[PDB]
Amino acid sequence: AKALAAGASTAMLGSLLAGTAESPGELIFVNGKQFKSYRGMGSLGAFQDDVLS
Amino acid sequence: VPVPTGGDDPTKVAMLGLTFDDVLLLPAASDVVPATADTSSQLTKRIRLRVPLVSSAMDTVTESRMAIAMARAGGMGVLHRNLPVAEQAGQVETVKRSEQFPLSTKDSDGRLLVGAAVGVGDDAWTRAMTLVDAGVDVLIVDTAHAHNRGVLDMVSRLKQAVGERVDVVGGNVATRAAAAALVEAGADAVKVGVGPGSICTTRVVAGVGAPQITAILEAVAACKPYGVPVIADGGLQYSGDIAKALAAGASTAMLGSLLAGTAESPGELIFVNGKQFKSYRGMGSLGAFQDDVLSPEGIEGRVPFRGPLGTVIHQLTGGLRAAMGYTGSATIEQLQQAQFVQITAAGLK
Amino acid sequence: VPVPTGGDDPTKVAMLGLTFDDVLLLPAASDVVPATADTSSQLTKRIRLRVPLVSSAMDTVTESRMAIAMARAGGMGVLHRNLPVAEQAGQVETVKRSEQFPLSTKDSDGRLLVGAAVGVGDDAWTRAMTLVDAGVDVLIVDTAHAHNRGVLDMVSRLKQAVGERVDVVGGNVATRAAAAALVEAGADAVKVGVGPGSICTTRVVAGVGAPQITAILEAVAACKPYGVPVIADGGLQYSGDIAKALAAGASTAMLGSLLAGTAESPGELIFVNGKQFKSYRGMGSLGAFQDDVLSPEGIEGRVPFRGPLGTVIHQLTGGLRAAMGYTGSATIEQLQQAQFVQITAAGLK
Amino acid sequence: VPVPTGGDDPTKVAMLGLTFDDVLLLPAASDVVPATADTSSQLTKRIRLRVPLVSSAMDTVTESRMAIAMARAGGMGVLHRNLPVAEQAGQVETVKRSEQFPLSTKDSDGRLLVGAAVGVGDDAWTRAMTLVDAGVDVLIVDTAHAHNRGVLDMVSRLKQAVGERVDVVGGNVATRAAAAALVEAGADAVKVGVGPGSICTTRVVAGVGAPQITAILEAVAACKPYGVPVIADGGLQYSGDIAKALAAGASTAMLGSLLAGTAESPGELIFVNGKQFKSYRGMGSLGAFQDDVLSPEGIEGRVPFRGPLGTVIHQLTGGLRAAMGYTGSATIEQLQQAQFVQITAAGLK
Amino acid sequence: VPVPTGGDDPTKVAMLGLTFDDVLLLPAASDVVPATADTSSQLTKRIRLRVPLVSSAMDTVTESRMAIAMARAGGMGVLHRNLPVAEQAGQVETVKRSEQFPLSTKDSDGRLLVGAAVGVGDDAWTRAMTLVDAGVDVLIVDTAHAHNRGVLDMVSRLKQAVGERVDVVGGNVATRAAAAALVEAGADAVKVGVGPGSICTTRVVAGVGAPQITAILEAVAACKPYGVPVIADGGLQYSGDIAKALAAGASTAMLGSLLAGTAESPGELIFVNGKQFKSYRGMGSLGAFQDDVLSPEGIEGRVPFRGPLGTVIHQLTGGLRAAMGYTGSATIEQLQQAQFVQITAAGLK
Numbered sequence A: 001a002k003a004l005a006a007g008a009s010t011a012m013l014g015s016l017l018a019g020t021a022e023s024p025g026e027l028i029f030v031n032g033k034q035f036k037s038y039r040g041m042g043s044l045g046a047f048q049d050d051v052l053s
Numbered sequence B, C, D, E: 001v002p003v004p005t006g007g008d009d010p011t012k013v014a015m016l017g018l019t020f021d022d023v024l025l026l027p028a029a030s031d032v033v034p035a036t037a038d039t040s041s042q043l044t045k046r047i048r049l050r051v052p053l054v055s056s057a058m059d060t061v062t063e064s065r066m067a068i069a070m071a072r073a074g075g076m077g078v079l080h081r082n083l084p085v086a087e088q089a090g091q092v093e094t095v096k097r098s099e100q101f102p103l104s105t106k107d108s109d110g111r112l113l114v115g116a117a118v119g120v121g122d123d124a125w126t127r128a129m130t131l132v133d134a135g136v137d138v139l140i141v142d143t144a145h146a147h148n149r150g151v152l153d154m155v156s157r158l159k160q161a162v163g164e165r166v167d168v169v170g171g172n173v174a175t176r177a178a179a180a181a182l183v184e185a186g187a188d189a190v191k192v193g194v195g196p197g198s199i200c201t202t203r204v205v206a207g208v209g210a211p212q213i214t215a216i217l218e219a220v221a222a223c224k225p226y227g228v229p230v231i232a233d234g235g236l237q238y239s240g241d242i243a244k245a246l247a248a249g250a251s252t253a254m255l256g257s258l259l260a261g262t263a264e265s266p267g268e269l270i271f272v273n274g275k276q277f278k279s280y281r282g283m284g285s286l287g288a289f290q291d292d293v294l295s296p297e298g299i300e301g302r303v304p305f306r307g308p309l310g311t312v313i314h315q316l317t318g319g320l321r322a323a324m325g326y327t328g329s330a331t332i333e334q335l336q337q338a339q340f341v342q343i344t345a346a347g348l349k
């Protein structure tokens, strides 16, 4: 709401959608809880020819 | 001259009681593939289950859904009695009315088997007659201490009245004398265990109990010459415990907390800090028609959610099949003759 | 040829000592409803209590308020002696001067029973005479090690002087020989236990102690042929422990920390982080008229607030009644003949 | 009349099983300097190792690098079989082709000794023939329960076919009868242990196991009159455990997790919060050609990085030499006659 | 037919070993006031101490200051040997040259008694001769395993040379045979204990040890008929342990970590987070003239600062006096005849 009130017409969402069921990656179980992976495009683990990634 | 533990009476301390953690199964000459082991065993003298497991008659474990799932999985379910008689009769009728399940247990009419638990008294007699009319298969005279005169009299009356239509299973016992008394009364099966938990509330509040392995051995020592099956009830935590109980002479194992967290058990799923839990209370707990005098003698708690009942039953049956393969037991009657090795405290760390 | 534990003397290690956690009560043929079990038991040869419980003679447990509450609840209280003689006589008079309480213990004049603790010596003799004049009912010759010559001589002197007006109870013993010596001296009851706690300070500082079950068995083995009751003192943590102590042959159980946190005990209520606690110290502690040579041999601490004494007494009596129902004991004299089952370390986890 | 542990059969509980933590080595008359103790021992009837240690045939312990390192250190390595036959033959060839190492174990051609593990079946027969053609020295018929008819038949067939070129070692056993059966089949050595871990998955899932000291004693009691060596496999955590295993009659000790964290073991080094660890999983784990029916029966985990294998081997050999000096054993054959002292639970805290 | 623990040899497991935590002292007929108990005991056949305590010959426990303090407190100190011979002779001379201390132990010339520790060898022979010339009173042939031929030969040589001027104490033993061998060699006293700690490094690294109570009993069973005193060395944690060791037959107790944290012990005081600690390491530790072959077999650590040595000695002596009062022992020779009661694991929680 703050981003749209500042003048932006659209908001792009990252981690808020990473843990959903429709996102890629395998579901992980840790101590009775459920988690999913999330990494940036500039991370060490992650065609990424971006110099400033 | 005196007893090394004190006093002059050698029988003041009757025996040394072994529990599940005190023994292990010794491997023997085995020509049995675990995938081909026959796990069928007698529940009563006239009922044979494909999987020797029975659901506990507890208000947080067995209702119509759990009874149907257990009957489909190869075992049987015993409906609890912490509710009005008409509701229990309705549950029995619901179970009876209900190629995926080749191991399902069914009567001569093709309907799933079900068991019901009754108490002691005139109200319990009316409940038993209503349940028999509803089509129940086996009645369990469920009492905390079955060596009472009233429990034996109730078992005898039930066998006199509806002894040919249904089966009668006696309450919990822990000694050879009590098992012999139940057999004399006319029970079709004997349920064994009184304070089998390590920190069971009866052992703390009343100081009364009996280790499960020794109790099973003594009860089998009294029941076996007459062909009366034994149901080990309580204290089981793993499939290894089930294998140990069946190797001590018991023909059936009754499961409690192992089935409480399944999806087929009653109660609403609870979410705590990202984890899933379900309620679990004893019939003698403060929170929990419970006219049992010796049934607070229990506690409330929660157990983690485990999923579908079939997965848990399959895991337990796989553990039992592994034990049968190790001991070289083609059938349960051959597993009941396996030998034990007693381990010290060092082997429990 | 040699002893398997080392050396050549087979009696160097006298016996194997069982504690409360090593035994359980075996169920037996029971026709007893727990609500109708008779819990009355002898305190001395001439005094019978409706509830077989007695409050410890400790400065943080028993004073006039606690003694009156115990006498109303069906048991009795023993006033401590860590104060001037006149103050103890005043406490006795306060207790004696004071349909809600059908189980109250009273003398032939309708006044509540009370007991007082005395030491050994001429000052203790003056204290005992003052307490007898004040109207005390039973005198406890309270010593840590009662097998001393002086303790027996004091017991004999008390029985010679006021043996017909009041009763005399010997100090703490842990062997059959000491109990026999106390019986020969003329004690009306024998109090049993020397270092009964698992981590008791006597066992750590002095290396001296005796497990409570074996000590009770040996003391009963010496006291029973003469009709001298036994008071198990120390080591009790649950109602199951009380049932085990009474089933081993003891006629009365003396309670310490179980009654320290009640509202009727002396001391000011303490608040810590939103919780309530009260002080609790042994008579041999550094902080705590204590002319006992073998009485630092104790520690200070705090116990949670428990509320009114009646609730705790009712809980303990309910546990005892449950044990009596399980063992089929209509009276305490029938509970004293119950059998034990010995459990391994695996059953204590 | 009945057994004190319950029942009427005195052989229902066969024996009391001692583990490594239950015993200690008693010092004796010693004229042996630890630096001059001879640690050489028989692996099979025809192979003698300078250091009586063997690496486990596990996918996270022994490969070509670890096998070469073990052969150089004075012991031997057994290559695992969780891979295609051609790959295992390549590993054997790599080991065979490969003054720093005066204790290295070599054949008559000057090439390092190596062992390979095979299963039971026709595919296992093809694997064994391929490994023999590749130049393997000893074949281990690795099964979880070696008292099966098929395992004995496979051992007999292998001894009939390639019994003069290579040696045959039987699978894991835990009883005297199984060891005698393996000896009769024609095994050159017997590997001992079935559920030797304290919390091993077989003991929890299947309820089957045997304490290692008693199993070693029984297997030696059957193998020694025929000169068949014994390899204690599993349960070893310290060099003291190795000394205890060799003192019970075993001629060789097989090491698992003690060698998993070394640099010569397979797997990539893992960094967690500034520390170094390596993977370790059982052959029966879910993550882990494993046609063993009784092989989930294992768990995955990680063990800390330990460095070069030589340091660990030197530490273990120093501990063994210290034990030999304490017991006055000039050779391993004299260490196999040392006496044990059994300790209680108090000495394990 | 076979042994219940496995095998055919009934002597493979020699005995069951009891430690300090396995036993308690039984009260007996007592006419002894703890304040008047005589604690004097023999150190050697010619030396009697007023307090039966001796300081360990460790580099972090006993030097000249600690030796003087121990000699003043009523016991004696044994100077360690982890230093050049001239320095040890200087320490002995410093101790010998140095109404407050009525219990001080002194020779016929009024100078404090002191003991010194020597090894085995020609350098140790030169050290022993230098120490004798410096005026030492007793020489301790300190070896980890005293059943060696060289240790006995050294003891015999020392007794032949300076046997009339000074006393000779044999190294650590744990069996009856070793104690008998030391007595035959001519030792004036026998020091007892080999791996007495529960998690002692010898028991973990080498798997060799012996519980202290059984070892003391066996050594007394060999030393007592000849009047050779016994010094229990190691495993003591409380004053109750000292009382138990003296009640098992030992005449003197040697103290380690109990005296390491005192102000009279060597080493610099260390401050950590507002608390005070001091170093403590074994003679077999990596950090620690130690020509002992079987002496890493020890660990380093720190113990809290305890203050002056006299306070600790008084606390230990008070505990011993309490034990003597409980057991009715007027002298240590009467405490050496007290009886034990064996407790189970339940009484150790």
Ligand SMILES: O=c1[nH]cnc2c1ncn2[C@@H]1O[C@H](COP(=O)(O)O)[C@@H](O)[C@H]1O
Pocket: A012, A013, A014, A015, A016, A039, A040, A041, A042, A043, A053
């Ligand atoms: O590796 C990375 N470093 C920095 N920004 C990244 C990286 N990968 C993606 N982004 C951008 O940062 C945003 C983070 O979204 P958020 O996680 O919802 O805040 C993404 O939607 C991309 O636009």
Ligand SMILES: O=c1[nH]cnc2c1ncn2[C@@H]1O[C@H](COP(=O)(O)O)[C@@H](O)[C@H]1O
Pocket: B056, B057, B058, B201, B233, B234, B235, B236, B254, B255, B256, B257, B258, B281, B282, B283, B284, B285, B295, B297, B298, B299
């Ligand atoms: O409150 C209770 N106290 C004692 N036993 C109970 C109570 N409720 C049920 N039981 C019995 O104890 C068994 C415990 O099963 P478990 O939890 O699998 O050991 C149940 O199946 C019942 O037979």
Ligand SMILES: O=c1[nH]cnc2c1ncn2[C@@H]1O[C@H](COP(=O)(O)O)[C@@H](O)[C@H]1O
Pocket: C056, C057, C058, C197, C201, C202, C233, C234, C235, C236, C254, C255, C256, C257, C258, C281, C282, C283, C284, C285, C295, C297, C298, C299
């Ligand atoms: O300082 C002390 N040391 C040892 N025993 C004590 C001490 N003070 C009281 N006692 C006795 O030990 C008992 C302990 O009771 P408990 O706390 O209920 O086990 C008391 O009731 C007294 O009989």
Ligand SMILES: O=c1[nH]cnc2c1ncn2[C@@H]1O[C@H](COP(=O)(O)O)[C@@H](O)[C@H]1O
Pocket: D056, D057, D058, D197, D201, D233, D234, D235, D236, D254, D255, D256, D257, D258, D281, D282, D283, D284, D285, D295, D297, D298, D299
């Ligand atoms: O998955 C498994 N379950 C049970 N035993 C196994 C498994 N994998 C290997 N073993 C055996 O158990 C031993 C354990 O060795 P440790 O880890 O040194 O005790 C191995 O050396 C194998 O002989």
Ligand SMILES: O=c1[nH]cnc2c1ncn2[C@@H]1O[C@H](COP(=O)(O)O)[C@@H](O)[C@H]1O
Pocket: E056, E057, E058, E197, E201, E233, E234, E235, E236, E254, E255, E256, E257, E258, E281, E282, E283, E284, E285, E295, E297, E298, E299
């Ligand atoms: O490094 C060592 N390993 C084993 N025993 C040792 C070592 N150093 C000293 N000792 C002995 O073990 C005893 C331990 O005493 P404690 O610490 O009082 O139990 C010492 O007094 C020595 O007799």
